[PDB]
Amino acid sequence: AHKKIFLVEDNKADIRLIQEALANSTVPHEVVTVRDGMEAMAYLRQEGEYANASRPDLILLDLNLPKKDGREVLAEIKSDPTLKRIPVVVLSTSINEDDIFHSYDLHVNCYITKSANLSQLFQIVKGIEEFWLSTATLPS
Amino acid sequence: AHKKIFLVEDNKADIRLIQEALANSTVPHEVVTVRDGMEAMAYLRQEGEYANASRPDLILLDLNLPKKDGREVLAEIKSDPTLKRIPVVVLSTSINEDDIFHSYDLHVNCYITKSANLSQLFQIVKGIEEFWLSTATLPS
Ligand SMILES: [Mg+2]
Ligand SMILES: [Mg+2]
């Protein structure tokens, strides 16, 4: 009984920290990380090599992504008849007001800005894990 | 169950001595050394070629390092949510009250003034080894 978390992020530093914070969970989880919007969609639509990759229970989405940005990934996921139910938490350095408004308008479940202080960000990821992987009841 | 010690030192003479002082161990220790602060942080943050280097269980840090001093190394280590728990033993020749104050202020675990005579320095390293790698209960 393990939940899968799909992290779409390219910053290796953040990837490391995020993976470390999620690793210190009270319940083991599976974290799959892809580094660009393209891979993100291919993985979620189980296209190609990602033929048998199981559906994630939670998606953590960075916005400024290579190839295809998070804004586009979000719009395509929340518009898809089947992927739209997967909770998406945008976790980004962006404090841009347009990004905030647009993300919620596209039905993102939640928007979180990456802290400037590593330890703070670490605690934020812990909050994400505790609330979504423990307190909330996820679909399916 | 072997212990991994990370030595940040540029004085080849001290490196040789410390290495030897840590060779005696029923369960062989894994000693890794780097000669400068830049290399130290890259290694600890698992950047690039160090992407797969395991986290040490103890760090021994020199202050007057090339291209990036131990002061900065200490601050960056103690501010990182994934490295801040690794015990850091500052082992330097400095007896400067300024270095002592700042090092403890930055959360160094302990500060040790190297002993001139290579032999006494040996007994000091043995003290470090017994207390930290045997007496204390490490987070690792
Ligand atoms: Mg990015
Ligand atoms: Mg030096």
TrEMBL record, chains A, B:
Entry binding sites for Mg(2+): 10, 62, 64
Keyword check for Metal-binding: yes
Keywords recorded for this protein, A-Z: Metal-binding
Recorded superkingdom: Bacteria
Name of the protein: Response regulator
Organism of this sequence: Tolypothrix sp. PCC 7601
This protein's encoding gene: rcpA
